Amino acid sequence: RDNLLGISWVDSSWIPILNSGSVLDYFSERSNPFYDRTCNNEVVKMQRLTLEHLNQMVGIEYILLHAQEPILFIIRKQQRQSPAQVIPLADYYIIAGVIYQAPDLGSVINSRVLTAVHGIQSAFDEAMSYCRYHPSKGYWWHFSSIFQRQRVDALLLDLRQKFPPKF
Amino acid sequence: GNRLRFQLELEFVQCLANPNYLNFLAQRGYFKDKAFVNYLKYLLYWKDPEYAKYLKYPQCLHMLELLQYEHFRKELVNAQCAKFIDEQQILHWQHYSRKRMRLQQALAEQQQ
Amino acid sequence: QLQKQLKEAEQILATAVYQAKEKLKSIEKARKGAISSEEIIKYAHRISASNAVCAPLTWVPGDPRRPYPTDLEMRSGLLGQMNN
Amino acid sequence: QLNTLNKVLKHEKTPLFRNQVIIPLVLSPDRDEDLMRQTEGRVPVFSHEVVPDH
Amino acid sequence: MSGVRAVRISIESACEKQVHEVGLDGTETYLPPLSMSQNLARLAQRIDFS
């Protein structure tokens, strides 16, 4: 209950017996952090029959939004003021029988920027301690040719021509 | 009691044969503690036959040995690691069985 | 020529005795190996009673039968249940 | 420069970002040569692991 | 028949061929060449020089 975005809930038995008809039931298994007893689908189950009753009694109605037959089954949480009036609250998507909450385009980006820049800041602090700059010297970071080589290179090319390389 | 110790240790060693649980423990940082390596070293008593007699899932023992190399625990924090190890495990299993069966059947049918 | 032939013979001897040493190593493992057969049969039945030793007849890429204790078996498994 | 620019962009009369919700339509284990090109080599063949991971 | 008597039966390890690498879509790989005569030079490669 700390962070609904950071919770995942699953159950193996319901996994093989999963179909477009049963997705709402899987969300409804109860003891599932994302869904709640307050939702009216639960009230409908407590009563009898599920038909156009979600358009009659209008309120919290979890409804399937988009479905791919094997695994992908997206669910949407709506709050209805009246028939033909829908207000979307949140979206919970089920991938491979694993339910997650759809991250906000912005909460995700905020957390993402925070982790990257925290890493950059740790690296910077460590590098600053590594440095040992002084008024004398460029910056101690603690924490040639004798020019007789042209004749040597001439001799090298001479022995190259004389003794050819053999792969 | 010692009975509960035995049962919990058996369950834990049989559970260690799961790459998902291994990646779980590696990501959660349980391997970095010097207590878990000593616990693993103590867990080597399962190699005895009297203790191996109670192991239903034997695939764990070999895996346990790898955990002692001290380079297996530094890696495996990645999910691709669990991916690849479970891939190779299930591949060895299913391919060995079904490939022996299919090779025998196909050779018997072709030679006739 | 004699030296070359001798060297070839030496190599042959080496490989042969290396294979003999491998056989000796097997024999040393085998000596400690001898055990009750009934016990072997019982252990084979234990490891083979489930889908662990042999892949199932109809086991394609998509099965709850896993080479490990799944996750529902873990959820009721003594391990974390008693740690809780 | 980059961080200041990003924060500045996020806070200049831009749409409310907590409103929108990211939802995946289709996942196919098929090889894709276009997502590999588009994301510059990482994240190829939109599989099942990649949506809980990202 | 009844009351089977278990005797000291010794069995040798069944290591005739090993599957070093297992590829996808079948295709078994028997990398292990089971050699030593060349393994001495292979280990000599590991030996240092510097």
């Binding site: - | - | 890429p61 998509g62 | 996942l27 196919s28 | 996808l24 879509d25």
Partner: peptide
């Protein structure tokens, strides 16, 4: 189609 793949999809 596309059941979760323990071995890789063929």
């Amino acid at each position: 189609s596309y059941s979760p793949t323990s071995p890789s999809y063929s």
